[model samples]
Target chain A: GPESVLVNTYQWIIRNWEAVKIQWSQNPAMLYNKMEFEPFQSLVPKAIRSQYSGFVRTLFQQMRDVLGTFDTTQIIKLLPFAAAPPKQSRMQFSSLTVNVRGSGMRILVRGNSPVFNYNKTTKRLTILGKDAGTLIEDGVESAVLRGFLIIGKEDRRYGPALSINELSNLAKGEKANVLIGQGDVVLVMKRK
Target chain B: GPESVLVNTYQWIIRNWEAVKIQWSQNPAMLYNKMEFEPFQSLVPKAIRSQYSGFVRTLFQQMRDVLGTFDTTQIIKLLPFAAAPPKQSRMQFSSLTVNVRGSGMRILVRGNSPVFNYNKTTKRLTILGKDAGTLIEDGVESAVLRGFLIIGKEDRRYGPALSINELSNLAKGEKANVLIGQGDVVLVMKRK
Candidate 1:
């Protein structure tokens, strides 16, 4: 189930690659959407609004130049931070930095969680399942809530990623001693 | 459920916010974990790492001067991007920029569906649910997948907000005619 979230996380970005490219190409600095950006939003259509970062555009362009864009199946594999099929649960833990077009993303692997952090070279983590013992008290839960909302706000995803049940449980500190959910199979992260 | 992922996304950054701060503060442009960053990560312990961004530090210091931090509950309310209680699902399609503590996040409200684009003075979409007849064929599903993963990657979450069932259904083109998911109370985005 947790793997599914990884799958969800994988496709979510893949589907929006073109838009993501446009978002970063022109506004590489502005990671999120903003009111001030409205002035620019109307300038172009939703699909091809912005330019790609020089570095990212170069990555693709170079790929095309070097490989001729024949096999897209293989071409897609060229992505800096790419993922495997969703059906399979692939996990890795390492420190890696990805300059996708222009959205600079760096993942740091702590122990083991559905989430992954990859090094520049390492492809997969050695072990899988259960991260180090971290507390899930209300304080941590709310802190997590604030963090995702901030990100959602940046990603323009409105609302949050946490579920109502998770929030309620965390609110009363009833699940402070819980792993992730009370009687839930896996966490909502996977289900959501 | 989804909240835990949201919650996880929350602390994922807060816990590493310090290291992220150092990684970006000196090299605000480069955001990632690298051997070069290892030096900075170790330089500062987990609690409070390196200095804050000029803009971020200045905001909190100025806030302290204006408000004695007595009403942090109220003080937090003054944040640029504020969310309702963790339990409450506060949804508003508005364009706003939040320069919180050190995290600068801006949300753009898209007209509706999947991605939201908004303006500061814009109003809500007339219909609450179901976006225009957008296709969800193989291409659309993959596109949605990519969009979310990029967001998840940038957010440092392992997976995305998409669901397992959604992923499986999309995998076989069973819901190729759908907008988001079939038989789901609300799209993960809506539910989240």
Candidate 2:
């Protein structure tokens, strides 16, 4: 059930990324319509339905704000999903390819049997077991992505972590998302 | 004439720190009233008068935006000028003391006979020759300021440099003010 929920949420986010990005720039709080989140919200237990909804909504806002802090021209080109996908583009994927045309860089991350760990008490999900990917620069493979993508509570070995509380505090000032290089490049996501 | 202009600009910034901070949060472009920059504007030649005014105004906005990134509770406690001073306060100082009340930390930066260098071609001012001050934590001096306050072009030995053009680009995303530790703590001011 949790796996399906996670997959559905991921698909929803991927589908609406461009629409939400455009609307968020104008009004941050109302990034998505209530109906959009109803599918995921209805799946959760009635006792924690409101809490789950709030968490998802807050996460969407945080994601939008963090994405707001990048050079979109570069990012959109590198990650096609960053902008609207072409009408002819296929949605299904066994692997992900990120292309940075200007810099002649491309990353191909192959998908494997991913291991998902969900903690009911913490309401956190950790996804593990994606294979190391290939990084090509100027038609030559330069590096390989090391370790699986782990998304859940912060791992110090990977990078610095920011809780929702810390993100809210950053709203008082400014927020920063840092990239950490611990053997492999790790993305440190912060909130504001 | 340039030395006086630099000092006047410094004083104006210090005096209007709070006022500008409040207003900038609401209207970033109009951080200061036109009258506030008239003194510096009148000193420059007519050919460069408008250019200098624009420079100063842009600088003010950059300063405000950079400052917006700091935690005011800690900064205001450490640096008195960060916020509005009390009515009973005396502004004149041969030395500056910054106290972090909660952390039990204090910094005393002694003012010395400062050297002023103004470049006419670049229209920049550099101040040097202040003695390294004492940094105390828990009432014990732990460190000292490493170098004189050099304000002009970016120094690679010190930290990364961001030009006005770079800052304007950052405005499309998010802005960050970084502190570089190259021997001493160097404030890397970026604009957005």
Candidate 3:
């Protein structure tokens, strides 16, 4: 069940993420739906509650950018951290290239922008995105985003199909907060 | 559940559809998943299985062309057919435009070959694909193929978002199989 959530993460969009981002004043209710708050909301003082909610919202968005998309079930994994704040830094980057120089493998993307080029021989991977000055960009939920997942699969169906452990480790990894393009980091995929 | 399936249809792929096309005869097992029968498959005898598989495969592909990307749960909607067999004809054409003649809305998609341009004045829709001798045709899925479910939502999410009942009614409608680009059809979208 956990693995399925990770595998399908790319398809998940937290519907409540927006509200938390807006409130910026409440600790996200542990168990609540839509705009409603949990009955436990009264236990916490209003001052801390507001700030906690805002931080959670920001942390969650950054996590999504790094972890790709994840649903509510998987979102709970982040809850443990609010009690003991985790590291809040990531290695920043602008551009990433993989396995092209002096490598025998040649890969081409047949459609759209932000496509992936992979070389199985050297296990090289390259991500190409829109050129906005020094910044390299990844399209959100576009073919390019799907291509990231696709490159990892034995089948070239175009999706990462990430496992639970892999995604969990990644969300906690150093590169997690780095933006793609000027923020997109290069990832070298290991072969099975 | 049916509505959810239909909504998510564009996100699902009929993987076996490809194997049946490439292999010519293996029952389309290894190369795909889901959508067990063609609905039209069982009606024919073994002698015609080979040819019928090809045709059914072709029809499904062409239907996908028009339907664009739809998933399995939604694909079940296509399952109930072959009652005395259905007509196997489509009017071929290369270009299509929508809502252009007398309306005030204007939209244009530009490319080297066949493109779509439209206006909201006379509610005219026009399609222009390839113009070759005897009409160098493209499947409805190609442009209108991509364009079909594309007309479904805002933000180009690509889905007609049809219910089983709604789609069946469309299939029986006159312009349902008009091949799009040649004979443009009018669809009335209502906000519920």
Candidate 4:
């Protein structure tokens, strides 16, 4: 549920990116205006609210600086989830770590031996294991992330869609991996 | 200079009126947003600031309430100055009182025996005399209008264009007269 909420919210913001950009160009202060972000903030979980706020602020700042050269598709491609996967295979991991970067801060979600299943026909990824906790470091001073949860998609349309082969690629023995799609942050994954 | 400023400001607002209406429909509070009004407010004279603010607020409220039924030209007709003159004749007035009505307030500018000259070829109305202090009556508190000055147009295109006959008609004994154009309030004038 949380993952769907996050994904959907990101998509909605992406859809309105051009309007927000135009409004920013007209009134630069509007980018940081509290009222403008209230709708999205209300939907986010309290645990990740600070991190989310930081992420959004950084994202808007960066986007505004380069507005003339960027488009919705470019931002969409920066998202952390893969839209479609490659092939099928069985994958295993002893431990997995995810890193998300904002302007000057980082959010790390670490888990121990995560068990995940990928359905090719349905285009779904299910996390069968639990995450340890989140560690936010460098520049985000007051945020506390309790624990991480995958919260995979029930329907084929919504959450991350990764094939077993793609999952295995992410598990390629100590190599850092990158995920791409339509997310708000720069996401990277590592296995050990 | 002041007359041209007022006319140009009015015309500019009228040109952007549709956009303002659309914004108001999307966010009703934006109509009252102080920041949204800053650019236009900065261009107005300090003496008439209160009246101008009240006029704009009342006008916006009325327009927002009837957004589906009104257009720019309808509001244009409510102005206190005529855009074109009917015919020519030399006219004189002993005293002239102008009444402008807002939502629950009224602004009156009265002058004693002001001499004015109209140029048909140039479409200009020139005021050659001064007025008594302004008397703001009913509902608008804390505003002081020192005196009325008929700041006429030097250029042909920027101010009221009234024929001498039109001035004579306005000067007709004891009867209150109305002027129409693209102003922010309902205007009525009386001659003695």
DockQ of each: 0.02, 0.01, 0.01, 0.00
* Model 4 CAPRI quality: incorrect
Candidate 1 at A157: error in angstroms? 34
How accurately is candidate 2 docked according to DockQ? 0.01
lDDT of 3 by residue, A1-192 (tens): 322222122122233345543332244433223323322233222223333333344445544554453333223322321322222321111111112222111112112123233333443222332111111112222112211222221322312222211222232212221112221232323211
- Give the least accurate 10-residue stretch of model 3 chain A, judged by summed lDDT: A89-98
lDDT of each: 0.25, 0.29, 0.26, 0.29
True contacts kept of each: 0.00, 0.00, 0.00, 0.00
A34-138, model 4: which lDDT tens digit per residue? 243444344332323343334333343444453243333323222222111112212211111122111111112221112223333443333332221221111
| Candidate 3, superposed: residue stretches over 4 Å from native | A1-32, A36-192, B1-131, B135-192
What is the fnat of model 2 with respect to the true interface contacts? 0.00
For candidate 4, give the lDDT of residue A152. Answer: 26
- Sorted on DockQ, highest at the top, how do the candidates line up? 1, 2, 3, 4
- Give the per-residue lDDT of model 3 (tens digit) for B7-95: 23311223233433343234333322334333223322322234322323343443444443333222222222111232232211121
lDDT of candidate 3 vs native? Answer: 0.26
Residue range A1-192, candidate 1, lDDT tens digits: 333333333343345556545654355334333333233223221211222112223333333333222222222222222221112211111222322223322233112233332222443221123221212111011111111111111122222223221232233211211112223211211111
lDDT of 4 at A41: 44
Winner on TM-score (1 vs 4): 4
TM accuracy, model 3: 0.19
